Amino acid sequence: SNQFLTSDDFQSPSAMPQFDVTPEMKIPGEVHNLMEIAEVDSVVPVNNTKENINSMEAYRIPVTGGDQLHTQVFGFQMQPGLNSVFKRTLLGEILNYYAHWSGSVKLTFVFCGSAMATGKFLLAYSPPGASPPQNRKQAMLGTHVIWDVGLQSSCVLCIPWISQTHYRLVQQDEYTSAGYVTCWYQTGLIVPPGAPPSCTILCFASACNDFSVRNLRDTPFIEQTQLLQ
Amino acid sequence: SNQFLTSDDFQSPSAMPQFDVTPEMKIPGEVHNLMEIAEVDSVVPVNNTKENINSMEAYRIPVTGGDQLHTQVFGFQMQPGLNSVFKRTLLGEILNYYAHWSGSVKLTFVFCGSAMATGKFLLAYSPPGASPPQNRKQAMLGTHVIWDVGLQSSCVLCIPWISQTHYRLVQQDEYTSAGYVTCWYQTGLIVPPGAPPSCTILCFASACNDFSVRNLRDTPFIEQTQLLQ
Amino acid sequence: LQQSGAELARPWASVKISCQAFYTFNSYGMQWVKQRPGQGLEWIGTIYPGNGQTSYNQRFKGKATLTADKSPSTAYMQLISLTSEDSAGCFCAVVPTVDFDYWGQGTLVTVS
Amino acid sequence: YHSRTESSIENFLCRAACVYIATYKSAGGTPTERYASWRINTRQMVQLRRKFELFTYLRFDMEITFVITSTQDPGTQLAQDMPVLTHQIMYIPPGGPVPNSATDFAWQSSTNPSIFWTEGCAPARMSVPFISIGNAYSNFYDGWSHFTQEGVYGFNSLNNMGHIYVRHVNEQSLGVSTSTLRVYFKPKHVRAWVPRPPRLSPYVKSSNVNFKPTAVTTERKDINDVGTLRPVGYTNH
Amino acid sequence: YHSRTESSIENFLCRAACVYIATYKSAGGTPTERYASWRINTRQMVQLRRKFELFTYLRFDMEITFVITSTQDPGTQLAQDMPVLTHQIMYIPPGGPVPNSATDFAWQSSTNPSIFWTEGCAPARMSVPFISIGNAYSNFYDGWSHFTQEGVYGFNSLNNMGHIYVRHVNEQSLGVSTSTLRVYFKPKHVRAWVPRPPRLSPYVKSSNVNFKPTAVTTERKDINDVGTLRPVGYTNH
Amino acid sequence: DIVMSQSPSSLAVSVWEKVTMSCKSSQSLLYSNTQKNYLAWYQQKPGQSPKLLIYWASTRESGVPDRFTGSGSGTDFTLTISSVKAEDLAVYYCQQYYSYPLTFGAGTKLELKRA
Amino acid sequence: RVRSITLGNSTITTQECANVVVGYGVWPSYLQDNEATAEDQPTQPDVATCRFYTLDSIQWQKESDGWWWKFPEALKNMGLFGQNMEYHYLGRSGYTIHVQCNASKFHQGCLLVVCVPEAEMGCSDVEREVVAASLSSEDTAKSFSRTESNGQHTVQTVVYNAGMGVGVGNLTIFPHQWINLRTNNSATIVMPYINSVPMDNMFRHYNFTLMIIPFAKLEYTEQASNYVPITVTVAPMCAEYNGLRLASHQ
């Protein structure tokens, strides 16, 4: 009509015709899709206890050494872009720019201990309509891998995409419909005389190749509204 | 739209259709580009001391004869269309009509002395991020030619185009980023009995084939605003 | 901060003046000033260790030599063909291209 | 290798320029402010005059555009319900009947092309071809108008483009409506010959080349003085 | 298999956004509120600043649209019969004459492209190409403006897009008309390089990257605490 | 060579009298990169080594009162002495950071006038 | 498997066979014809500047937070490459930063070695600006801090915001490598020349910043040497210049 849709692509007359643009040169690192920024790993803040968020201690998962053998290392609700654990990483900063999302999440746990240390962890994953495991025996009968840190230093754990519908709302919260990724002590942490007994795990989350988003909007993080000065 | 862009090419209905225009005849001297006016040499006012600008003495570079052998003849900052030396010549009157410029400048120094006179001048050029030479020994180690006026009467000195970006702003001033063209006595000026000891140089500046301009605007020289009468 | 102790010289001969800097000789050269009680301060030269440059005022070219080594970390100035006109107090100063800052003491050259 | 299309003669001499702003009322009084008038000459505006006077001989069509904004005058007996203003813009071809004042027969002459334009829509536009007995217009004329070297030094030349006259068509009795005309002149298909030097001295009047003796250029410190040598820093020393 | 066209760089950085709302009157007083002015920078609006600061180097054309709605001011000596408001929007190209106030020659400068728009129809639109000496704009500049590392830490860079100045063309004597401009800026043909992390700290000013130290993320109950375990029902037990 | 002028060359003044002293440069010691004048002010106490008064022609040093303040720009400067005391009787020399021959000024000798 | 690398007739570095990171996917190269705007020829000093400039070693202690060097100021005094930064006007160079540590098998820890293009940094005081003396030293590292810096003209050197106001775990977006002392020992990143102009003056502009941040802190028992030396070695690649003159600045 004779209206102005703000979401309407139209050519306009150039204000400065007869002007030659500077010839574009080859700059390395061209981006064509926002999903290429989401498919890189970013360090996941798993240890947010409110006394570590203002330090580097909210990136290090503590694995103490001694006699536990039945307790938990960590655990979180697997919902990227909504979880306090995931909403500030590169994947969950891009998901907050969109209202729908669909795809897999790839986790990677790196054991940052000494080469003389040896142990075993049970990395369990629970499905979306399922309760978090409460002990190591319940987590064993679910979906688990055994990460023997004497043999491998990283444990890549890819998480499947299970939903009734095609996409999934990012800001909408559906409790007990996302999945949980917990980790349990299996053996402990065995060190020789001279090695430090306690250690550190780091987690890295990204997207996969089947990832997609839809329905762009404004990020919840920026609250400022008035112009700067 | 239903607007009026002043920079918009549109055909209009002819007010006088049915009128036969006078057949155009061959007039010599057709101009197709403004750069053809800039690629001619114009005499450069190098000697502007405020007592010569209202005379012809602001075109003649004085080369006195005697015992100097270490002093300077002239020197200017090489920025066409902004320098008091260059902004009123043909090249620097066209550059003031545009906001961007790019290309080389060709200088030519003509020794207007007698055929019996002999001497040598050192014509140094300094790069854009470089200080003006202070004596003849500093100018020798830079970029120089030796102009022996007994052999040649003109010394053509073309100046390269060095910049970080593609074009360059004309009115914007960037000190110590343009280049300096100085001239030093090497030998003196040797004359036989009967020849005049003092002489005269004239400078001629133009553009080159790689010259271009962009972003047309109004010349800074014309200040009158109200219509004539 | 330190300068040579008072010394007695002979005309038509040389003098070597020393200066001691606790600060490392980097990014900033060592100043040399000659004071005339009747007149004012006069700059002799500076040797810039950070880039290693050595320079003198035209008046002192051929008169003053400036030399700073690395391990000793002491700045030196030598004058030659001394006459009564060279009798003066000579100061060494620092310059971080930010200021001339301070000088300190200095042996009164006494050509006699 | 760059492009030189920005400094062609078409791209340098074809920009629209406001060359004339006048005002004209719509009710009686003196019979002069009821209409506007502009003899088409490229000499009253110095900015465009200097660009045209880089050439001796020019040849172009015209592309004139009129921006007419009206207003309601204050005082008593107001306009109130004013229906719509219609304006007549008449181009008197060179040697054509020229209106002495408003409501004259010159306005109704068939010979003078006219535009009837109603307020509230796109502005009025007209195009005039190259109208000369000669084969170009001349910015300069080293000569006289009569064959006996008598008259004026280059003013009655065949460089006449005509006039433009604008008035209200309405017969408005109560209330006055003051309109303001803006003329945006633009040359099309420009062909230019014999390049001339750009002018140094300022202009005095739009009938001459008269001038006062001005300096070749601006004052400088000395014959060999570069400006503001960089003060000693940690790179320039 | 889904489609990834929703998160391309063109579809993520090309949405129109209101970046500047100003107002400008039409009668006298102080010579400041009679016109509007906006230096084109993508730093005053935080929402668009964060999207542009996911990249180091950008290259785009501009597509600016102006939504001008006027009103009649209260008080005595009312507008009454106001004929139609015409507005001039001038784009001063970088390094171009900039108006000190209303009725200045900068407005009539041929160099600065302008739009004359009459109220009651579709809004005014203009497109500006990539105007830079460099080969891209830079959202970040780890460096200085002068060669001596002197001046301001990244503000006089060649990232200048120009200004936009808007005024009333009318000469309105009786009555004041206050117009409000809305600028809907939009980039076209965006090409972006060197992806950067999204910002955590809030902004303080549109000339810096200054910030206050903020937490990496929000508070959580404990190192291993999932939220709201389902209370025993007839399926979850 | 850049020369530094000082006027007056010397002046005798009593206690509690606001005195100034000009130091004019033969070249503007102000560059257009940072807009910071290259001028130094120095106090040489009677029979003593000089000390710093004002650097960048605008900023004070430690252990220095507000009766020593740089002031000016371009090529003309002065040092306002607001409330003189019994520690100002000395010779003062201005200096420039700009041209490599770092010449000092003529040298104002602020003299003490007694009863 | 212990292959030696000799670059120029001065340098020898010994290194095993490990993984490299090549830029944003491009190798450094020389400027072609349709890429420059300058009015002259580059005259690259290939015969003298391509060697290894091994900087001083930092000590990774138990309580250290991180270090950064700004480039190309990090080679301002390093030999002939520092002379070319003086006696030229424009410059263009890629680099091959090689970072390696000497730890035992009884040490543990993890480093992140980032190359951040245009790492513009905010000040420790809002409504104020940094100085050049707080951005970088000429050859030594600048330390991040665990707590909040509070100076007037300094840099906000808190470690989890990386001096740029971002999340420190998201610096993995730029070219990076992880030195995990359990398995990895070394890290080598090949940075190209990234700018918006083909050549810039390498005194005012900082092309990139090399940050080395420990994410898992260093632990050791009481027998052990209580630090791990981190040795950085920078080798310039395809350096070319323009504008021969004197040393106008510094």
A 10 A CB-CB count for G187 gives: 24
- Determine which helix (DSSP H) or strand (DSSP E) holds D52, and give its type and residue range: helix D46-52
CA dist., res. F103 & res. F5, Å (int): 10
Q: Which residues contact A91 (CB under 8 A, 6 or more apart)?
A: A38, A42, A80, A81, A105, A205, A206, A207
Both structure tokens of G218: 């260093």
Contact of F62 with chain E, judged by CB distance below 8 Å, is answered with no
Q: Are E198 and G166 in contact (CB under 8 A)?
A: yes
CA dist., res. G208 & res. E56, Å (int): 12
**Residues G160, A55: C-beta atoms closer than 8 Å:** yes
Contacts of residue E87 in chain B, CB cutoff 8 Å?
Answer: none
**Residues D5, A19: C-beta atoms closer than 8 Å:** no
SS3 category, A171: coil
Q: Which residues contact F114 (CB under 8 A, 6 or more apart)?
A: none
G→C interface, C-beta within 8 Å: 86, 138, 247, 250
Both structure tokens of F2: 């850049």
Q: Is the peptide bond before G28 cis (omega within 30 degrees of 0)?
A: no
**Residues G194, A28: C-beta atoms closer than 8 Å:** yes
Q: Which residues contact D110 (CB under 8 A, 6 or more apart)?
A: none
SS3 category, A56: helix
Q: Alpha carbon G99 to chain centroid distance?
A: 9
D17: nearest Cα among D38, D43, D48, D44: D48
Q: Are A56 and G168 in contact (CB under 8 A)?
A: yes
| CA-based nearest distance A21→chain D, Å | 10
Q: Alpha carbon E86 to chain centroid distance?
A: 23
**Residues B99, E94: C-beta atoms closer than 8 Å:** yes
CA dist., res. B73 & res. B63, Å (int): 7
Q: Give me the DSSP letters along chain E.
A: ----GGGBHHHHH---EEEEEEEE-SS-SSTTTTEEEEE--TTS-HHHHHHHTTEEEEEEEEEEEEEEEEEE--SSS---S----EEEEEEE-SS----SSTT-GGGG-SSS-EEEEETTSSPEEEEE----SSSSEES---S-SSTTS-S-TTSSSS----EEEEEE-S---SS-EEEEEEEEE-EEEEEEEEE-PPB-SPP--TT--------SS---S-TT--S-PPPP-TTT-
SS3 category, A92: helix
Contact residues, G window 131-170, toward A, CB-based 8 Å cutoff: 146, 159-160, 167-170
Strand ranges (DSSP E) for chain A?
A: 30-31, 42-43, 61-63, 72-77, 98-102, 105-111, 118-126, 143-148, 154-159, 168-169, 180-190, 199-207, 212-216
Q: Give me the DSSP letters along B71-139.
A: SEEEEEE--TTTSTTTTTSHHHHHGGGEEEEE--EEEEEEE-S-TT-EEEEEEEEE-TTSPPP-SHHHH
Name residue E229's amino acid. L
- Determine which helix (DSSP H) or strand (DSSP E) holds D10, and give its type and residue range: helix D9-13
CA dist., res. C94 & res. A205, Å (int): 55
Strands A168-169 and D35-39, how do they pair? Answer: unpaired
G54 φ/ψ angles, rounded to the nearest 5 degrees: -80, 110
Contacts of residue E116 in chain D, CB cutoff 8 Å?
Answer: 67, 123
**Residues A18, D6: C-beta atoms closer than 8 Å:** yes
- Tell me the domain boundaries of chain B: 1-229
E211: nearest Cα among B114, B18, G155, D112: G155
Contacts of residue E56 in chain G, CB cutoff 8 Å?
Answer: 117-118, 194
SS3 category, D107: helix
| CA-based nearest distance F103→chain C, Å | 6
DSSP letter (8 states) at residue A33: B
Q: Are F98 and F2 in contact (CB under 8 A)?
A: yes
Q: Alpha carbon A202 to chain centroid distance?
A: 12
| Torsion, Cα of B213, B219, B221, B227 (10° steps) | 160
Q: Residue B122: beta bridge partners?
A: B146, B184
Query: Which chain A residue has the Cα nearest residue B212?
Result: A20
> How far is CA A75 from each of CA A82, D20, D190, E226, rounded to the nearest angstrom?
15, 79, 78, 7
Q: Give me the DSSP letters along G39-51.
A: SS-----HHHH-S
Q: Are E209 and G121 in contact (CB under 8 A)?
A: yes
**Residues G250, D230: C-beta atoms closer than 8 Å:** no
Q: Are E89 and E66 in contact (CB under 8 A)?
A: yes
Q: Residue B165: beta bridge partners?
A: none
A 10 A CB-CB count for G57 gives: 14
A 10 A CB-CB count for A184 gives: 26
| Torsion, Cα of B91, B93, B97, B101 (10° steps) | 30
Q: Are A58 and G167 in contact (CB under 8 A)?
A: no
Contact of F32 with chain D, judged by CB distance below 8 Å, is answered with yes
Domain range for residue F98?
1-115
Q: Tell me: domain C2-111, CATH 2.60.40.10, correct?
A: yes
Q: Which residues contact E113 (CB under 8 A, 6 or more apart)?
A: A15, A16, B5, B6, B7, E90, E91, E93, E126
D→E interface, C-beta within 8 Å: 15-18, 23, 47-48, 67, 69-74, 78-82, 85, 119-121, 123, 175, 177-178, 180, 182, 230, 233, 235-236
Resolution in A: 4.1
Q: Give me the DSSP letters along chain G.
A: ---EEE-STT-EEE--S---EETTS-------GGG---SS-----HHHH-S-EE-PPEEE-TT---EEEEETGGGSSSHHHHHHHHS-SEEEEEEEEEEEE---TT-EEEEEEEEEET----BSSTTS---HHHH--SSS-EE-BSS----SSSB--BTTTTTTTB-GGGGGGSSEEEEETTT--EEEEEE----SSS-B-TTT---EEEEEEEEEEEE--TTS-S-EEEEEEE-EEEEEEE------E-
Both structure tokens of D11: 């791209």
Q: Are D217 and B205 in contact (CB under 8 A)?
A: no
Which of C27, C51, C97 is facing G247, going by the closest CB pair? C51
Q: Are D67 and E169 in contact (CB under 8 A)?
A: yes
Q: Residue F108: beta bridge partners?
A: F92
- Determine which helix (DSSP H) or strand (DSSP E) holds C46, and give its type and residue range: strand C41-48
> How far is CA D62 from each of CA B13, D66, G225, rounded to the nearest angstrom?
11, 13, 89
Do G and B make contact via 3 or more CB pairs under 8 A? The reply is yes
What SS3 string covers G97-108?
EEEEECCCCCCE
- Pairs across C and D, CB distance < 8 A: 8
| Torsion, Cα of D202, D204, D208, D211 (10° steps) | -50
E134: nearest Cα among B168, B101, B102: B168
Q: Are D93 and D110 in contact (CB under 8 A)?
A: no
Greatest extent of chain G over all pairs of C-alpha atoms, in Å: 63
| CA-based nearest distance F44→chain C, Å | 10
Strands G58-60 and G228-234, how do they pair? Answer: antiparallel
Q: Are B208 and B39 in contact (CB under 8 A)?
A: yes
Both structure tokens of D233: 């820093």
SS3 category, C78: strand
Burial C5-28 (b: 16+ CB within 10 A, else e): eeeebeeeeebebebebeeebebb
Chains touching C by CB (3 or more pairs below 8 Å): D, F, G
CA dist., res. C33 & res. F3, Å (int): 16
CA dist., res. A127 & res. G170, Å (int): 28
CA dist., res. A21 & res. D2, Å (int): 10
Q: Is the alpha carbon torsion for G40, G46, G48, G51 positive or negative?
A: positive
The technique by which this structure was obtained is cryo-EM
Burial G86-114 (b: 16+ CB within 10 A, else e): bebbbbbbbbbbbbbbebbebbbbbbbbb
- Tell me the domain boundaries of chain C: 2-111
Name residue D186's amino acid. K
Q: Are A66 and G146 in contact (CB under 8 A)?
A: no
Structure-token match 């109950």, residue found: E221
Contact of A18 with chain D, judged by CB distance below 8 Å, is answered with yes
CA dist., res. A132 & res. A126, Å (int): 7
**Residues G86, C51: C-beta atoms closer than 8 Å:** yes
CA dist., res. E147 & res. B177, Å (int): 9
Q: Are C64 and C32 in contact (CB under 8 A)?
A: yes
